[PDB]
Amino acid sequence: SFLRRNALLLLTVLAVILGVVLGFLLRPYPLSPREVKYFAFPGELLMRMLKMLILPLIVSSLITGLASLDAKASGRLGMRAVVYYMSTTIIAVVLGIILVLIIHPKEVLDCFLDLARNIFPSNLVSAAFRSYSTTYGQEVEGMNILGLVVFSIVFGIALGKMGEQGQLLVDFFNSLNEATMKLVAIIMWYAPLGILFLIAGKIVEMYMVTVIVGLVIHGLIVLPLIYFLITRKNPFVFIAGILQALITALGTSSSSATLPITFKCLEENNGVDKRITRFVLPVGATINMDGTALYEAVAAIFIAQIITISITATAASIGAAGIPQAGLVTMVIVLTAVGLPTDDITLIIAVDWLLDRFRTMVNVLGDALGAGIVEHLSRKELEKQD
């Protein structure tokens, strides 16, 4: 009965172990890294299929998400969601400093300007695939999620204040979100074939231990106890539904790439209201620092062998939303403010390929558990609409 009910998640569990085993079976690499790319190809296709659906999901989710909700109420439960994104990050930043205290193993100012320049895009067509970042054309390949999310929020809320006239395109983007979420059903089945070929190509190439210690204790103790404190419901039962999304989080290593799956794992598996998931999930894929700030704060102290380092590490990953090799460049810029050499970066690249997979896993769990706290803390607002 277990193999019949939960069939696809047992396949992804089989894909993780088979991906490690087959990868370790073909570990002595006599072939050039060019041939490794040809081997990791079936997993590379899944990423293209997922990246395809990021843009028409993020745009359509928020536009309907802020329109379905009253402009006055949505602005209030939105501030309630900010409470989660700020508190969990504060505890994580604090946890990172204690973690290195017991077990010790482009300009800086320009990144705060590029983040503000990315928030308000110059062209929405250019925002859909090019992100702004000052270089010495500043626009470079990689979706400007921070700009599209900002426009979608103010555009979506403008439709809530429109009513009669606005009703047309709101029904359009809801049908569009339903269309893009009907394409995700097929992408979920290609995931086992993808993941096993994707992680196998990435394996064939004490700080590492420090990171996982803090990441697991935050995702299994800190975050679930925050959920149990307000909702008064078991967190593992909520975790059981989002299992098909948390396993893919390791393979994808991007919260944006897993967003189409994470959406179905909350709306279908756990049974969470669409009106709040469409409001929490897109913002959470960029604003949430729970896992990525906890990874970057530990990275700064390890190579050095306090308030200024934390703020710079936060504004780094928010500025580099879904751009390829985001963690690689952001760690360089954060070292200019502290005054540390860039020679140590040549070693963390050969260890980030497995550590970034767990970084996303905490980030995806945070947005999912965040929506669970939001739903319970906004039940009266949701009943007002019905």
Next chain:
Amino acid sequence: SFLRRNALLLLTVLAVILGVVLGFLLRPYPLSPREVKYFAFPGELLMRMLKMLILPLIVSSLITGLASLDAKASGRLGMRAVVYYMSTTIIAVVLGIILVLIIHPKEVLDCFLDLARNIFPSNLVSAAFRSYSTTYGQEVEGMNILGLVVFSIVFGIALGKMGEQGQLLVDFFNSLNEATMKLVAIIMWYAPLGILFLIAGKIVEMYMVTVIVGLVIHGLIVLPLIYFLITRKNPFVFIAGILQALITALGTSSSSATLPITFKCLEENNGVDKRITRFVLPVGATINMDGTALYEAVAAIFIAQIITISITATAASIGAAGIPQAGLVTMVIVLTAVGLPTDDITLIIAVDWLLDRFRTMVNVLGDALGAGIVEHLSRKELEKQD
């Protein structure tokens, strides 16, 4: 009562004087021009917020603008609008020659080919952010307004001939125009904070006098007397409404960047019919040469110290719609036809930063006063639809 009724325009007047004063207070610049960019940043954000809204306003304005109007009648009042864009330019070109007579202070052929190549875009997605211009990829960053306006006009009129089937997406773009015009309400409030920081960063760096003499006499005598001749109504009362747009025209220095504000200053402040503003304003932001041809014709004679120079100067700025540093490159190409050195251009760049602000001010007033003449000369066509 005056401070209560007209509050935001008194703030922009305060922003202009405070922008000059604070700029002159911090005039001795010990900092590198890189730091000037960081200072002019709050005004740089307003430009990104305005450029954001250009594209979804221009596309949606014309599509509904030509569909709401009868395909037979719209084609006729359109020719009536061409009468304005041709006559005012002829008088301006003539005024420029008299102005230099009393007070004397890529190829040419390729620009006429690039203009024709820009009119019909090869790809509408590429047209939304890349303009065609031959270089020795010809497509370069900067919206192809000339191509999007052309498509929107023939696409919008195709919906007027569609009727029943076409009614769906016409109601979509009208709701979309209403959405983009509901976002402009917040951008209008960021303008005082923007303008004061934007003009201050631009101040810290007899021909100049000749230009303003011709520009003021055209905008305060020539254009208002043309309005008073047909409408038989006071032009200053019409100018009083568009005050919030004319002040921003100095700061933005682009007729396209001020189009979202100019739209509200005509539809809300002066109380002009949407059906004709959506028809006159987008075309006027590119086709109108009243101020920019009057600036370029005087530029040619001053550095030289007749029919061929005027036509080449007209087709230059129409070809370079909203592309950055349009006046800088177009003045180089116009000198090849007359046979004059490019050494004189190194001096006008340090004076254009204040002169281009008044160039746009005449251009924005021309499109606004043009719509006023169009409304009065097409009252019977508008009554036919009701």
Next chain:
Amino acid sequence: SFLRRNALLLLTVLAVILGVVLGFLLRPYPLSPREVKYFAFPGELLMRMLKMLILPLIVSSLITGLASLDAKASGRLGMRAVVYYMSTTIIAVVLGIILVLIIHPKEVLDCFLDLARNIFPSNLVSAAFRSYSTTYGQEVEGMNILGLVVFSIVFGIALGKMGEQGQLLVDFFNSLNEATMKLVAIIMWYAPLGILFLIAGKIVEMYMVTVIVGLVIHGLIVLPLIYFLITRKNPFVFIAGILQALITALGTSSSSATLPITFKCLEENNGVDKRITRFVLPVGATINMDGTALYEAVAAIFIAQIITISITATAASIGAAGIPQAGLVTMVIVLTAVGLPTDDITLIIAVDWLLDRFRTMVNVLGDALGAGIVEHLSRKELEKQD
């Protein structure tokens, strides 16, 4: 009466002869090839006008084409269409080997990977104008038709399974297809002026004979006899309607560029059902190899003076959908698998300018005659919907 009924096709026939005559009248070229570009300009404008309409036609045709049809039935008549695209190619590849037997006159593996990478686009906005192809950014200018067609098919069929919710945007893209097909009426009239100036600029610059022999025998014997075998109707009567599209196929030399005209020549001239033309024509503009594989297979044997060469030549042109100079680069990659020098390519470029015009003519006829066979072999499926 003949000049009155069929007026525009007699003009395009006049354009072909006048284009050759005027071109041969101005054959001794004393002007640099830069001036030839300025001469071929009125035909260059038609191509921009046609390329403009490719993207909003391909996207809107398939989305409504798979939604109007039942998800179960469409998947079946789709397999019936694959029968045509596979059988006609098999006969063509076989015909090419017999044609060279009687009358004898980036990596290879990467192209099979790039084709799979193009099928699933990473970003739909980027897919609308940039195609993926590995180079040693892989994304380069030229519409990713293979990616947009794939998305449109799975997105369109997702709307058929949506019903009530999906009904909104399906009526949108059908009105949009009707809009883009109402713009094509004016482009059809610019074609005679275009073609005569476009072919004249291309003329002023035994293998050639071998190609036309096989191309004419396939398009006038093989393909029409396949039509007459199933439909039991005269093929020349069906060819008579699509005459306005077949003449333009010579001028455009691209099946995608002629798609907007080919659509009207089937829906209006021959009177074919929209539901199947919108399903056959976009796929046929890329997947069909009837003419282009017959051109490339003969190209390999001529320069050499069997199963491995045919498969590589097929996957080459499908990978290079509508990208400029597709036949030039694909012939280089196919020679690496066989092991032949690239010195022979410097001669075929000066002969492809007339041979590629007939290559498309066979490809356009194949898609048109394919739709004719599909309609007759799916009459019962079409009656089920009514």
